[PDB]
Write an enzyme that holds these catalytic residues in place. Structure first.
Site, PDB file in Angstrom:
ATOM      1  CD  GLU A  79      33.743  45.509  42.849  1.00 20.63           C
ATOM      2  OE1 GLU A  79      32.575  44.848  42.714  1.00 20.63           O
ATOM      3  OE2 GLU A  79      33.905  46.507  42.110  1.00 20.63           O
ATOM      4  CG  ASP A 115      30.288  51.256  37.870  1.00 21.99           C
ATOM      5  OD1 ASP A 115      29.575  51.148  38.703  1.00 21.99           O
ATOM      6  OD2 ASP A 115      29.827  51.723  36.755  1.00 21.99           O
TER       7      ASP A 115
END
Ligand SMILES: *SCC1=CC(C)(C)N(O)C1(C)C
EC number: 3.2.1.17
Length: 164
Positions: free
Chosen positions: A11, A20
């Protein structure tokens, strides 16, 4: 290696609101704020999550606090899902981390498909499960990450995260 180090690799860590892989406002270590197109909506979610007026920037400690909550939430989400719990219970610790990783990324609730993949994992048909998991929007949209998670399921080792 453990689930925290694994997800930290997958991540990343960003202290300011960013988008994202799907275009959604996110912050810290993969902490999804909202699927809303409004940055103000995202800032409101952030302020609520942190408990203070942030205006889009948090500290590393705060990012790690949301991360601890998110990993905990993924695990509890798995144990409360009648479909996932049996699979999780059937796995060794390394493969359990791979399952937590998938839940962290896509959620337990609202996730379509993967019934056959889960059945193959519970049957411990690692190579077949690995092939099946790859026939997914998940794999196609984030192939490098999906490959690491799938290799973890296929081998029960951290080979995909070592030297990485
Ligand atoms: S084991 C694969 C799987 C099943 C479902 C409940 C749809 N999930 O969210 C994942 C991707 C963990």
């Amino acid at each position: 290696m453990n689930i925290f180090e694994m997800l930290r690799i997958d991540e990343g860590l960003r202290l300011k609101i960013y988008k994202d892989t799907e275009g959604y406002y996110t912050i810290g270590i993969g902490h999804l704020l909202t699927k809303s197109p409004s940055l103000n909506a995202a800032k409101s979610e952030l302020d609520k999550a942190i408990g203070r007026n942030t205006n889009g920037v948090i500290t590393k400690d705060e990012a790690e606090k949301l991360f601890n909550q998110d990993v905990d939430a993924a695990v509890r989400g798995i144990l409360r899902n009648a479909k996932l719990k049996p699979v999780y219970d059937s796995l060794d610790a390394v493969r359990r981390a791979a399952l937590i990783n998938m839940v962290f990324q896509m959620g337990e609730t609202g996730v379509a498909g993967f019934t056959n993949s889960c059945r193959m994992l519970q049957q411990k048909r690692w190579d077949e499960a690995a092939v099946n998991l790859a026939k997914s929007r998940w794999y196609n949209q984030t192939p490098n990450r999906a490959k690491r998670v799938i290799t973890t399921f296929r081998t029960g080792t951290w080979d995909a995260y070592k030297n990485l």
